[PDB]
Design a protein around this ligand. Structure first.
Ligand code: ATP
Ligand code: ATP
Ligand code: MG
Ligand code: MG
Lengths: 494, 106, 459
């Protein structure tokens, strides 16, 4: 008989509990040890780490081709020693080692540009600290990866924390509270040290930082022990979002990683290449498979001076290793494919790459296609932007209507009833040559090209309904617009 | 003719799929072979196409209206010209309209 | 593919276009196509007129004129799709999903994927046709929309025994023009012309009002046995010649409002026609000329109201179309006693007649004053020894005006600064009216007041 006023059936309610742990022992004496526990401290995630391995496996193989450069590409890929950034190693490893010797609640903040080896260097610091756990002389403790960006709702930190320290499922408003219960209310002798590190907080706490406020509020105990870190790019964040009293009372340590020097860059990228540097290969005669120490034995090499210029150009801007390494890989690519194009094998005794093609790879990143495109358009857009600049010359307005520019256009034409190019594009634009066709106030294709440029991004149209008085703006420059303008033989003279 | 329309895309639009759209109906109506021949020779039906294509955008729409609309639109036009922002209202146009008629009948 | 053409009168262009565009085999149909038009052209009439021409092709029909938003379209679609499927494949098994299960196009896509993977086992492939009449005409419409409905053949897997196609219908062309970069097929209908709309109406409404009652009424209200249906259509015809020769000027090339006004004013013309009136329909037209001269299509007195409501409103039109300074000459009657000068009034005429203008503002005290000043005479005196000694025969600030005023803001014939959290009570508030001249005129000669002289002189 009743009717619900609005339905939700595509709901996917999650089976997660509202009773915190605080209400399943009911006294201080009533509690067991988590260390003497099979389900706590994560002895069960491994099965779901291996349950899904087989889902995507095959053994198809037909006429494998394999070539010279690719092995070096994957020598050079980011998925693997480094002595370049080692004083921060010798300092933060010192701090963390002395910290777990102190069993205190210490806190640290680092930032740095994307491409500073921050995640690399840190992941390796703590790998060395894993081997220190394999010393079996330091108290065992446990890592926590925090990729809020690989999380949806930034309160899920607490949820996943509980579902990985316990494997138990709740909502944040039970989990974090049970967790405070887990932290301060719990003594030391059985609670464990855990180490945690936050990644890219610039988007995680965007509203009011009540989450991270809770976090840093957890980081101020003497009965609870933890090892906390975070990552960002900006630096004022601890005092920006909090204010000064909080960030000051906590008294943490601050750092950021910078762009590397060109020499360290080349040192390291070659450090990922010395297994293959200057090496010689046995090489078949049909597929060109480079096989190592109907077959040749040739040498391989790459332009070292090109290493110099390539690292040298991008060490000065940011210091992004990833950029350097992709430049390397793409140079190798153009070398390899030109080589293949030489012989033309199909699809079913020296080899070296040049500073010329290294820079050919490094440069087109900065060489924009927009210019050749805007030069290689039709006449109309060029004409119209030229009229725009004519107006900008007539008034110095920095902005124009539609009606004013269209007036400029018609004037810019009917003045030039004498130039030949405009003589010959004359009748075939309003009614297209023939009779039976009445005139039209505007030209053909003007709406087309308008929207074309709008999609292009150069043109900016405010929100109005009138076709005439709608204000219009250009986005780029007038100089570069002239670097399209006079490139037409007919436009330079008018 | 068809080379000239090739020119047209080369200068008007510089993009193909609109062209394919225009090209389709040519065959799409094509019924026998002598018709195909003569029609793609003259391309006189490109004329019908592109006359009825953007036919009703700005002009033919004003081509089919009463004279009353014209009188009042004039009464709006000349007074917007008299004006700063070109703003206008109902009875204003009615006034200048009747003035026009008084002049005509005078 | 053999397509029977609809041998239509006036759209054999678009007939050619779409009967060429579309046939049973989907391959010779496009992926997405528009049929824009304008109202009255029978674009919607002629689409089904073509489906008459081709029965073995079928289509679904939606009318979001009534829907409001996106999700209700999703729901209606998810309904009609599988409805149509199972209604037309009876033998096929199913697990009919809830259409209300949809709340987002992804969910629509998901459930259609389920529809198809259950309809996997067909003998030949099939494309069907969806119809969204007035997809511009929505009521919370925004601009992030049409591209998405283009992209429905996008995410569908290519191995579909059952596919679909989209159909649209718009008016303005402005928001069409906003999006034609996608190089789309399109077919269109110009607003008709006078012989065209003429013949559309002589072929369309002819049988209707040839077979309405009032004929059969009048023929025997008059009781005249000299008749044939040729002449019935003939007199209807010349009557409509008269209709359109009148009001083509009024409208041009439309049908709907003509049909309305026909229905309304037809019967009075029936009431006039007779034997002489058929033997010579000119004088008949003279005998029914009048509505041609005067549409008059709405419906002595105007109000059954109180008197202050009648007379107070009369004042505010003055206190926002009169200069506050140019009134003290005409709106005074007191005999001066102490020394002091009046002003000169309007030395200069104004040439624009603020009747044409968006009027001004004022505080209320101006009305309190001016209304007392105009007020019809009450408090009748005698010239007696004490009659006028204490009478103070002049209306004063009672409560009744305050409350008969509060009635008016709710009757919305006064306006104020249009406001949520209105407060009638402020020092700062400006007021106004929202009425024309004719409102204030229709009061006057009924109550027998005069103010036309206060306005009739300046321009
Ligand atoms: N000293 C180095 N030794 C070896 N590889 C390096 C070195 N410095 C940078 N790299 C390379 O550059 C990348 C830098 O990674 P980094 O730790 O800076 O990521 P990130 O800055 O945390 O990324 P994001 O800012 O997006 O979180 C590494 O993947 C690594 O391959
Ligand atoms: N080619 C035609 N032949 C015969 N009658 C026509 C033709 N075109 C229009 N009509 C008449 O005009 C009427 C218009 O109907 P309809 O509402 O379909 O017009 P429309 O333009 O589709 O309106 P809407 O804007 O609501 O879609 C039709 O019902 C029909 O009687
Ligand atoms: Mg990182
Ligand atoms: Mg319709």
């Amino acid at each position: 008989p009743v009717i619900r006023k609005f339905t939700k059936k595509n709901v996917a309610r999650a089976k997660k509990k509202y009773t915190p742990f605080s209400k399943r022992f009911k006294s201080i004496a009533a509690i067991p040890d988590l260390t003497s526990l099979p389900e706590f401290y994560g002895n069960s995630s491994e099965l779901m780490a291996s349950r899904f391995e087989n889902k995507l496996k095959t053994t198809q193989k037909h006429q494998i081709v394999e070539t010279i450069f690719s092995k070096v590409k994957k020598q050079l890929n980011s998925s693997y020693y480094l002595p370049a950034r080692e004083n921060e190693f010798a300092s933060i490893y010192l701090s963390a080692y002395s910290a777990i010797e102190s069993d205190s609640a210490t806190t640290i903040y680092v930032a740095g540009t994307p491409g500073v080896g921050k995640t690399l260097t840190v992941r390796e610091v703590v790998k060395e600290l894993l081997s220190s756990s394999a010393q079996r002389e330091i108290p065992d403790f446990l890592y926590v990866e925090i990729n809020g960006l690989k999380m949806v709702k930034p309160t899920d930190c607490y949820e996943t924390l509980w579902n990985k320290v316990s494997g138990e499922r709740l909502t944040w408003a039970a989990s974090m509270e049970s967790l405070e219960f887990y932290f301060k209310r719990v003594p030391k002798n059985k609670k464990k040290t855990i180490v945690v590190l936050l990644d890219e907080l610039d988007a995680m706490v965007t509203k009011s930082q009540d989450i991270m406020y809770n976090f840093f509020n957890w980081t101020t105990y003497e009965n609870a022990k933890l090892i906390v870190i975070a990552v960002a790019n900006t630096m004022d964040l601890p005092e920006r979002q909090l204010g000064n009293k909080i960030t000051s009372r906590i008294g943490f340590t601050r750092i950021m990683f910078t762009g590397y020097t060109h020499e360290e860059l080349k040192n390291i990228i070659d450090l990922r290449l010395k297994g293959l540097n200057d090496s010689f290969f046995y090489v078949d005669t049909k597929t060109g498979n480079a096989i190592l120490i109907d077959v040749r034995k040739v040498r391989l090499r790459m332009s070292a001076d090109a290493i110099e210029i390539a690292s040298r150009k991008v060490a000065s801007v940011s210091g992004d290793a990833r950029r350097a390494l992709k430049v390397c890989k793409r140079a190798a690519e153009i070398a390899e494919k030109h080589y293949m194009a030489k012989h033309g094998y199909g699809y079913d005794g020296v080899q070296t790459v040049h500073i010329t093609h290294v820079m050919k790879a490094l440069n087109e990143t900065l060489n924009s296609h927009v210019i050749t495109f805007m030069t290689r358009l039709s006449f109309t857009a060029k004409l119209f932007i030229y009229a725009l600049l004519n107006l900008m010359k007539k008034n110095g307005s920095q902005e124009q209507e539609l009606g004013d520019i269209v007036d400029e256009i018609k004037l810019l034409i009917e003045v030039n009833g004498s130039n030949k190019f405009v003589m010959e594009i004359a009748k075939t634009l309003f009614q297209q040559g023939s009779d039976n066709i009445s005139e039209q106030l505007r030209i053909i294709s003007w709406d087309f090209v308008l929207n074309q440029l709008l999609d292009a991004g150069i043109l900016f149209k405010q929100t109005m309904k009138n076709d005439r008085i709608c204000c219009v703006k250009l986005n780029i420059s007038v100089e570069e617009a002239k670097r399209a303008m006079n490139e037409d033989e007919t436009l330079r003279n008018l | 003719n068809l080379n000239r329309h090739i020119r047209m895309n080369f200068e008007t639009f510089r993009s193909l799929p609109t062209l394919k759209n225009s090209i389709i109906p040519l065959v799409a109506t094509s019924k026998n072979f002598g018709s195909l021949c003569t029609a793609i020779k003259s391309c006189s039906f490109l004329d019908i196409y592109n006359k009825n294509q953007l036919s009703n955008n700005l002009t033919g729409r004003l081509q089919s209206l009463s004279d009353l609309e014209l009188a009042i639109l004039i009464s709006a036009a000349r007074v917007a010209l008299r004006a700063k922002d070109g703003s206008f209202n109902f009875n204003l146009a009615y006034a200048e309209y009747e003035k026009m008629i008084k002049a005509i009948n005078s | 593919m053999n397509v029977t053409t609809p041998e239509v009168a006036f759209r054999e262009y678009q007939t050619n276009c779409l009967a060429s565009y579309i046939s049973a085999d989907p391959d010779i149909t496009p992926s997405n196509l528009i049929l824009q038009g304008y109202s009255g052209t029978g674009k919607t009439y002629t689409l089904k007129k073509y489906f008459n021409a081709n029965p073995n092709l079928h289509a679904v029909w939606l009318e979001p004129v009534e829907l409001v938003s996106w999700k209700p379209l999703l729901q209606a679609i998810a309904r009609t799709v599988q409805y149509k499927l199972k209604t037309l494949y009876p033998n096929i098994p199913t697990t009919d999903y809830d259409p209300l299960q949809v709340e987002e196009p992804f969910l629509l896509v998901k459930t259609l994927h389920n529809i198809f993977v259950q309809y996997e086992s067909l003998q030949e492939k099939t494309c069907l046709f969806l119809i969204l009449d007035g997809f511009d005409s929505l009521q919370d419409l925004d601009a992030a929309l049409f591209n998405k409905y283009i992209k429905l053949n996008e995410l569908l897997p290519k191995d579909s025994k059952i596919n679909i196609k989209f159909i649209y219908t718009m008016l303005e062309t402005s928001f069409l023009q906003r999006y034609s970069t996608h190089c789309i097929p399109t077919v269109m209908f110009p607003r008709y012309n006078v012989d065209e709309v003429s013949t559309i109406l002589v072929m369309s409404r002819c049988g209707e009002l040839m077979e309405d009652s009032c004929l059969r009424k009048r023929i025997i209200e008059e009781q005249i046995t000299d008749c044939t249906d040729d002449q019935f259509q003939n007199v209807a015809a010349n009557f409509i010649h008269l209709i359109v020769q009148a009001f083509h000027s009024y409208t041009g090339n439309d049908i709907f409002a003509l049909n309305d006004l026909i229905d309304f004013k037809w019967p009075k013309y029936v009431s006039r026609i007779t034997k002489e009136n058929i033997f010579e329909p000119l004088a008949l037209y003279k005998s029914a000329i009048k509505l041609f001269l005067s549409t008059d299509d709405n419906l002595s007195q105007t109000y059954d109201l109180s008197i202050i409501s009648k007379y107070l409103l009369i004042a505010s039109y003055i206190c926002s179309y009169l200069e506050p300074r140019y009134d003290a000459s005409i709106f005074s009657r007191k005999t001066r006693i102490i020394q002091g000068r009046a002003a000169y009034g309007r030395r200069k005429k104004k040439e624009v007649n603020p009747r044409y203008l968006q009027p001004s503002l004022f505080a209320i005290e101006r009305l309190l004053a001016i209304f007392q000043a105009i007020f019809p005479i009450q408090g009748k005196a005698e010239s007696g020894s004490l009659s006028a000694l204490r009478e103070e025969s002049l209306m004063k600030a009672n409560i009744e005006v305050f409350q008969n005023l509060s009635e008016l803001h709710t009757l919305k014939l006064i306006a104020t600064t249009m406001n949520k959290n209105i407060d009638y009570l402020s020092p700062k508030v400006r007021w106004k009216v929202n009425v024309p001249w004719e409102i204030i005129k229709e009061i006057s000669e009924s109550v027998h007041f005069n103010i036309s002289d206060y306005f009739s002189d300046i321009h």
